[PDB]
Design an enzyme around this catalytic site. Structure first.
Site, PDB file in Angstrom:
ATOM      1  N   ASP A 184      -1.842   5.888  -5.066  1.00  0.00           N
ATOM      2  CA  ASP A 184      -2.337   4.408  -3.839  1.00  0.00           C
ATOM      3  C   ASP A 184      -1.956   3.295  -4.384  1.00  0.00           C
ATOM      4  OD1 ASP A 184      -3.561   3.799  -1.792  1.00  0.00           O
ATOM      5  OD2 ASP A 184      -4.359   5.372  -1.207  1.00  0.00           O
ATOM      6  N   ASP A 237       0.965  -1.134   0.060  1.00  0.00           N
ATOM      7  CA  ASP A 237       0.169   0.045  -0.278  1.00  0.00           C
ATOM      8  C   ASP A 237       1.073   1.473  -0.133  1.00  0.00           C
ATOM      9  OD1 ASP A 237      -2.025   1.409   0.379  1.00  0.00           O
ATOM     10  OD2 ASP A 237      -1.753   1.847   2.067  1.00  0.00           O
TER      11      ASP A 237
END
Ligand SMILES: CC(C)(C)c1cccc(CN[C@H]2CS(=O)(=O)C[C@@H](Cc3ccc4[nH]cc(CC(F)F)c4c3)[C@@H]2O)c1
Length: 377
Positions: free
Chosen positions: A220, A35
């Site tokens: 992201d 992430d």
């Protein structure tokens, strides 16, 4: 020595990409979600209906308690737990072991997904957005500080079970074609970038470019969708609607709620537009664009029927916290997070997304005046 890290990512569609890690002594094996949208390394450390395994601190001779709680609220999902440090390794990554901060997750709400096959999250962004505060050193800063691993990594996220590569410490030239194009990291907290123009099927949206980055734009990998600020989202859906008005869809579809279906192999790809995002370049008045295909923002989802249909969810959704360039933008590009040089690179991925008469691309140079006015303050 990057070939050992090629194909070290697995995943399920809409459920993230994870890499295998070990924590503690002796090594406990966990799958960890990759992430770039956060900065906390955290793992299940207690039983959960959705966890197949978890981190057991009692069994690790190298575990250290930091005697300090922590919690992280994501846009969706959150967890709380206890901070500590332990030894961590990545089997299919660099050949090293580092002592890293670990958040042992004791409680959570809508964080773990049913049958995702990962049990933790690896936040690869900067300390600034770490919880409880920027004094908790993120995993990658520790890795770079304690080893000779260079301060960068690259992600190749592949679409249609999905796979990919996280190349730690460098760029693997076998994973992309064409040239790499770099956009500045505007500030080291999220991987924040500046979008300076948007086109849909070659038609400029014509908005004040601050709207594109209101209140920020970030890259992201933990987020599935492309997320756009309210005003931009509405302009985009209006444009994508118009281009596809040939057919008709429930409006819960445009809200990402209802699937749309077609007879296997008859998806009308041609009626959905390509989307071009222009990113600020490395030199004065210079930008470049990445073009997305519908094959990227129409996410293939499992059919809820005794049917061999092709079914999809609209994977562009509204945001109130800025633009999120999630997995469906990253898929089919090779993305280089060059921390050492405060920049992010894009190139056409070796597993690029396929269309009959069109192709995902990274193209430049383009001239763009006043790119600096595109940043929101
Ligand atoms: C800095 C922090 C406080 C962590 C923060 C708060 C709000 C938004 C962000 C931006 N990054 C966010 C955007 S998001 O919440 O949609 C997904 C999140 C990572 C994340 C966490 C648990 C998750 N559970 C299931 C998923 C879906 C994924 F696996 F495809 C998932 C993804 C990112 O990390 C960061």
């Amino acid at each position: 020595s990057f070939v050992e890290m090629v194909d070290n990512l697995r995943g399920k569609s809409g459920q993230g990409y994870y890499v295998e890690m070990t924590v503690g002594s002796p090594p406990q094996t966990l799958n960890i979600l990759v992430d770039t949208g956060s900065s906390n390394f955290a793992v299940g450390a207690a039983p959960h209906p959705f966890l197949h395994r978890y981190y057991q601190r009692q069994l690790s001779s190298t575990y250290r308690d930091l005697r300090k709680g922590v919690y992280v609220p994501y846009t969706q999902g959150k967890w709380e737990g206890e901070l500590g440090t332990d030894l961590v390794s990545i089997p299919h990554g660099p050949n090293v072991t580092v002592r890293a901060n670990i958040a042992a997750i004791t409680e959570s709400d809508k964080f773990f997904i049913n049958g995702s096959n990962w049990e933790g999250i690896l936040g690869l962004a900067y300390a600034e957005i770490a919880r409880p505060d920027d004094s908790l050193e993120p995993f990658f800063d520790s890795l770079v500080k304690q080893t000779h691993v260079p301060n960068l990594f690259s992600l190749q996220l592949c679409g249609a079970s999905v796979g990919g590569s996280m190349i730690i410490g460098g760029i693997d030239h076998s994973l992309y074609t064409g040239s790499l194009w770099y956009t500045p990291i505007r500030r080291e907290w999220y991987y924040e970038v500046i979008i300076v123009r948007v086109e849909i099927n070659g038609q400029d949206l014509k908005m004040d470019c601050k709207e594109y980055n209101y209140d920020k734009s970030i890259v992201d990998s933990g987020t599935t969708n492309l997320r756009l600020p309210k005003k931009v989202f509405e302009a985009a859906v209006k444009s994508i609607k118009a281009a596809s008005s040939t057919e008709k869809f429930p409006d819960g579809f445009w809200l990402g709620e209802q699937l749309v279906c077609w007879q296997a192999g008859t998806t009308p790809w041609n009626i959905f537009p390509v989307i071009s995002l222009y990113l600020m370049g490395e030199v004065t008045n210079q930008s470049f664009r990445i073009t997305i295909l519908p094959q990227q923002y129409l996410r293939p989802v499992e059919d809820v029927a005794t049917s061999q249909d092709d079914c999809y969810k609209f994977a562009i959704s509204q945001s109130s916290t800025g633009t999120v360039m999630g997995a469906v933008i990253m898929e089919g590009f090779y993305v280089v997070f060059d921390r050492a040089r405060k920049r992010i690179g894009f190139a056409v991925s070796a597993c690029h997304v396929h269309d009959e008469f069109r192709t995902a691309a990274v193209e430049g140079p383009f001239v763009t005046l006043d790119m600096e006015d595109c940043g929101y303050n």
